[PDB]
Design a protein that fits this description.
Radius of gyration of chain A: 21 Å
Strand content of chain B: over 45%
Entry title: Structure of dengue virus EDIII in complex with Fab 3e31
Shape of chain B: globular
Helix content of chain B: under 10%
Helix content of chain A: under 10%
Number of domains of chain B: 1
Largest sheet of chain A: 7 strands, mixed
Assembly: trimeric
Chains: A mainly beta, B mainly beta, C mainly beta
Keywords: immune system-viral protein complex, fusion loop, virion
Number of helices of chain A: 0
Strand content of chain A: over 45%
Bound molecules: chloride ion, sodium ion, zinc ion
Distance between the termini of chain A: 50 Å
Oligomer: heterotrimer
Chain A: FAB 3E31 heavy chain
Strand order of the largest sheet of chain B: 5-4-8-9
Number of domains of chain A: 2
Structural class of chain B: mainly beta
PDB class: immune system/viral protein
C-alpha cells in the first residue's frame, strides 16, 4: 500500500543545517507530487513547498524561500528537504505527503526537529511503588534533553492500562511520567519494569518496580 | 502599468493543481507596478480571465514575481510586459 | 496569501450525535472552468499524521466512511459528521489548493463526549534514588476521568502548596473517551524531610467532596 517513511527525529544546534528524507513506496513515484508541511508542537499546518518527481519542478512558500530546499533521488524513490540557518523557530515536526491534484492523500509519520544549543542530558529514571484488586505503579523520567523518550513496560509486553504523559519542559530539561495498572494478585510475583530509551543521549534505562 | 523589461527567472511549468506558473524577473525602473499580461489562443485571440494570481506586481528593480495562469487546452501564448520588450512564451496544455 | 478560518475552534459532541464544522476562505476557491472547489478536509488524530477525508469540497477519499460528508462552494464550506464515533476525536483542518502557496485553516478540535467518570487517584512518595541526588518528587496519577476539567491541590502538613507543581494531561483516550492526568510536586530532599503528611486532592465534576490521597513520610 501507499507509504511515506521519514526519520523520527533530528537534534541540531542553531546556525547549523539539516537534511531529512522521505522514502516512497506502493505506487509509481513519478506520477505524483510530494509536499512538505510544517507543524509547530501546539500549532497547525504550514505548507513549505512541493516537488514533482521526474520533471523536477519545485514551488516554495515565500516564507521558506531562504530557509528550505527541496530535492529528489528518483532511483531510490526518495525526496529530501534541507533547512538552513536554523533557529528555535524551526523546531517542529516536518511531514512529507503525496499530492493528488493539490490534495494530500497520504502522509509520512513526520520528522521532529529540535533546534537548541542546550546540552544533551540523559534521563534519571525513578521507580514509583505504592507507599485493592488493581495496583498502579509508575516511573518518573526527570531531567533530560532533548525530546523524545520512548517509554515501554516490560519491553513492550505490557501495554494495556498504560498512561504515558506528555513531557513538560522546566529549565532546559524535560520531565514526564508513566503509569501502568496491573492485577494486584500477580504483582510483585510477576515483575514489572519500565524501559526509558533516549536516543539523543544513546541511553536506555530499565527500572524494575520493587515493593517499598 | 509596468513598462520596464521583463525576463524569465524560471521557465513556465505545470503546477500540482492544474495551473501553470512562471517566475518573471523585472529589470526596469518605476516599481512597484502592474505586470502587463495577456493570453492569446492560437489565433492570437485574447483568452480571457485565466490569471489565477491576484493582479501581479513587481516590487522593485530586479524583483522576481510568480504568476499563475490557467492556460486553455491546445496552444497558447503568454505576452509579458509591453512594447518590444514584451516576452512571448508558448504553452501547450494536454487534455490530461 | 489566502486565509482559511475555521469555527468553532473546539467543540464537544456525543457518540451518535451530529456535528457541523465550518471553513471560510478569504477568496473564492472555485474554478469556473470545471466548477471544482479547490478545498480539502483532513483528520489528525493525536500523535499521528494528518489523514485526507475529502477533496474538492464534497468528494470523499477512498476508505473514508460515508458518515463524513463535505458540502459548500465559493468561500463557505462545511464538514458534517453524523453519528460521531469514539475514534473520531481529532483536529480537523481545511486546506485550499486554489493557488500557491497552499494554506491550512487553524483547525477545529473535536472532543468526544461520554458518560461522566470520577478519576482513579494514586499517590507515590519519592524513590530512594531521587532522594540520594537531593530531589524529592511526590507523584499523583489521576486516571480515566470523563470531563477534562479537573483541579489538583497539593497539601503539605495540610497546607496548600502551589510552587513546584507540574501537571500534564494525556490526550482523550480513543476507546473509553476518558482523560488522565499526572501532577508532580517537586521538592528538595531538604524540605521533604522536614514535613510529614503529603496529600493530593482531586476536585472533579463528579463529586462535591474532593478525592483525597495521602501518605506519611513515616
Ligand atoms: Cl521547610
Ligand atoms: Cl515550609
Ligand atoms: Na516508485
Ligand atoms: Na523489561
Ligand atoms: Na508527568
Ligand atoms: Na519486569
Ligand atoms: Zn517546608
Amino acid at each position: 500500500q501507499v507509504q511515506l517513511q521519514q526519520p523520527g527525529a533530528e537534534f541540531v544546534k542553531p546556525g547549523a543545517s539539516v537534511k531529512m528524507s522521505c522514502k516512497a513506496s506502493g505506487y509509481t513515484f513519478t506520477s505524483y507530487w510530494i509536499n512538505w508541511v510544517k507543524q509547530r508542537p501546539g500549532q497547525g499546518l504550514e505548507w513549505i513547498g512541493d516537488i514533482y518527481p521526474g520533471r523536477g519542478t519545485t514551488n516554495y512558500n515565500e516564507n521558506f524561500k531562504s530557509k528550505a530546499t527541496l530535492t529528489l533521488d528518483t532511483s531510490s524513490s526518495t525526496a529530501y528537504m534541507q533547512l538552513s540557518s536554523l533557529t528555535s523557530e524551526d523546531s517542529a515536526v516536518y511531514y512529507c505527503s503525496r499530492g493528488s491534484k493539490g490534495a494530500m492523500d497520504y502522509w509520512g509519520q513526520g520528522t521532529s526537529v529540535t533546534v537548541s544549543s542546550a546540552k544533551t542530558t540523559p534521563p534519571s529514571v525513578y521507580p514509583l511503588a505504592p507507599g485493592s484488586s488493581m495496583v498502579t505503579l509508575g516511573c518518573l523520567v526527570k531531567g533530560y534533553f532533548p525530546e523524545p523518550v520512548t517509554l515501554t513496560w516490560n519491553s513492550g509486553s505490557l501495554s494495556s492500562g498504560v498512561h504515558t504523559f506528555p513531557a513538560v519542559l522546566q529549565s532546559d530539561l524535560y520531565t514526564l511520567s508513566s503509569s501502568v495498572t496491573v492485577t494486584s494478585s500477580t504483582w510483585p510475583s510477576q515483575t514489572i519494569t519500565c524501559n526509558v530509551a533516549h536516543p539523543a543521549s544513546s541511553t536506555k534505562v530499565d527500572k524494575k518496580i520493587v515493593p517499598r | 502599468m509596468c513598462s520596464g523589461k521583463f525576463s524569465i527567472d524560471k521557465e513556465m511549468a505545470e503546477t500540482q493543481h492544474g495551473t501553470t506558473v512562471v517566475k518573471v524577473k523585472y529589470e526596469g525602473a518605476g516599481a512597484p507596478c502592474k505586470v502587463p499580461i495577456e493570453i492569446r489562443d492560437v489565433n492570437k485571440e485574447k483568452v480571457v480571465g485565466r490569471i489565477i494570481s491576484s493582479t501581479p506586481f513587481a516590487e522593485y528593480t530586479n524583483s522576481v514575481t510568480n504568476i499563475e495562469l490557467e492556460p486553455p487546452f491546445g496552444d497558447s501564448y503568454i505576452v509579458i510586459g509591453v512594447g518590444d520588450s514584451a516576452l512571448t512564451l508558448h504553452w501547450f496544455r494536454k487534455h490530461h | 496569501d489566502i486565509v482559511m478560518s475555521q469555527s468553532p475552534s473546539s467543540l464537544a459532541v456525543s457518540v451518535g450525535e451530529k456535528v457541523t464544522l465550518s471553513c471560510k476562505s478569504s477568496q473564492s476557491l472555485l474554478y469556473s472552468s470545471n466548477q471544482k472547489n479547490h478545498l480539502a478536509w483532513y483528520q489528525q488524530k493525536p500523535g499521528q499524521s494528518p489523514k485526507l477525508l475529502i477533496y474538492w469540497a464534497s468528494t470523499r477519499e477512498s476508505g473514508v466512511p460515508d458518515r463524513f460528508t463535505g458540502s459548500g462552494s465559493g468561500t463557505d464550506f462545511t464538514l458534517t459528521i453524523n453519528s460521531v464515533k469514539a475514534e473520531d476525536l481529532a483536529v480537523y483542518y481545511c486546506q485550499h489548493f486554489y493557488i500557491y502557496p497552499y494554506t491550512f485553516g487553524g483547525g477545529t478540535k473535536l472532543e468526544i463526549k461520554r458518560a461522566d467518570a470520577a478519576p482513579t487517584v494514586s499517590i507515590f512518595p519519592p524513590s530512594s534514588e531521587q532522594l540520594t541526588s537531593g530531589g524529592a518528587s511526590v507523584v499523583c496519577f489521576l486516571n480515566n476521568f470523563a470531563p477534562k476539567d479537573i483541579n489538583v491541590k497539593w497539601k503539605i502538613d495540610g497546607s496548600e502548596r502551589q510552587n513546584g507543581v507540574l501537571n500534564s494531561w494525556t490526550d482523550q483516550d480513543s476507546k473509553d473517551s476518558t482523560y488522565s492526568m499526572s501532577s508532580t510536586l517537586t521538592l528538595t530532599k531538604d524540605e521533604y524531610e522536614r514535613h510529614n503528611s503529603y496529600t493530593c486532592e482531586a476536585t472533579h465534576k463528579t463529586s462535591t467532596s474532593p478525592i483525597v490521597k495521602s501518605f506519611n513520610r513515616n
